[PDB]
């Protein structure tokens, strides 16, 4: 029985406005035990992390973006939209060992660290395969690294994480029996495995770092995977 963490589908904003997002959790109060992160994507499948921790603003980002918790929910305030803020917001909650993503809302404005993933993987129906994440820029050891699905209309799932200086790993529930998350120390890279590939497995998939408290700063460019005869 997973929590269902909801978004408001759809906002629209003009330049020079304030706007308000908000992330409901399906099981009570969004609290700062959820430790509320905020992530846009941008077109091109681009993600950056603006929030964690409920209200904690990651290094340039700019200032207009803000998290608070506002009517036991996670709010993300943009005061001042400009044009290239129109994208897709997406929140996640912690709960107690896994990361549950809302829905996403799309905004509409009227008017150094890398994560190198490979592009894309063509693979047939049943197969396996074994996606990579390259961290260059920073110490992989120092922070975790996630793993995300994302097939279109369908919003970020949550696969898991890995601690990459032990080892450990933490699931969804959805992909305990399906993900296998594995780090080599000497080249600082992420590796995740799948078997018994089918066209429910076809999305893109994201790398992204994490430092416990902080947020999902840096992500991946995503490997699309595409299982296709």
């Known amino acids: 029985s997973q929590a269902v963490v909801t978004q408001e589908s759809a906002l629209t904003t003009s330049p020079g406005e304030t706007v308000t997002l908000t992330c409901r959790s399906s099981?009570?109060?969004?609290?700062?035990?959820?430790?509320a992160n905020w992530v846009q994507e941008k077109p091109d499948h681009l993600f950056t992390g603006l929030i964690g921790?409920?209200?904690n603003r990651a290094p340039g980002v700019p200032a207009r973006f803000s998290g608070s918790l506002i009517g036991d929910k996670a709010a993300l305030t943009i005061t001042g939209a400009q044009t290239e803020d129109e994208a897709i917001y997406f929140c996640?909650?912690?709960?107690?060992?896994?990361?549950?993503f809302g829905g996403g809302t799309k905004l509409t404005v009227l008017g150094q660290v890398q994560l190198q993933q490979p592009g894309a993987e063509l693979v047939k129906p049943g197969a396996s395969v074994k996606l990579s994440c390259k961290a260059s820029?920073?110490?992989?050891?120092?922070?975790?690294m996630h793993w995300v699905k994302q097939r279109p209309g369908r919003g970020l799932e949550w696969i898991g994480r890995?601690?990459?200086?032990?080892?450990?790993?933490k699931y969804s529930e959805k992909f305990k029996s399906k993900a296998t998350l594995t780090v080599d120390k000497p080249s600082s890279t992420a590796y995740m495995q799948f078997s018994s590939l089918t066209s429910e497995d076809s999305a893109v998939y994201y790398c992204?770092?994490?430092?416990?408290?902080?947020?999902?700063?840096?992500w991946g460019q995503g490997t699309t995977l595409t299982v296709s005869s």
């Open positions: 820029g920073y110490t992989f050891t120092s922070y975790l």
């Open positions: 921790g409920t209200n």
């Open positions: 099981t009570g109060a969004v609290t700062t035990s959820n430790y």
């Open positions: 890995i601690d990459p200086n032990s080892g450990g790993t």
């Open positions: 996640a909650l912690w709960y107690s060992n896994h990361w549950v």
């Open positions: 992204a770092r994490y430092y416990y408290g902080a947020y999902f700063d840096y």
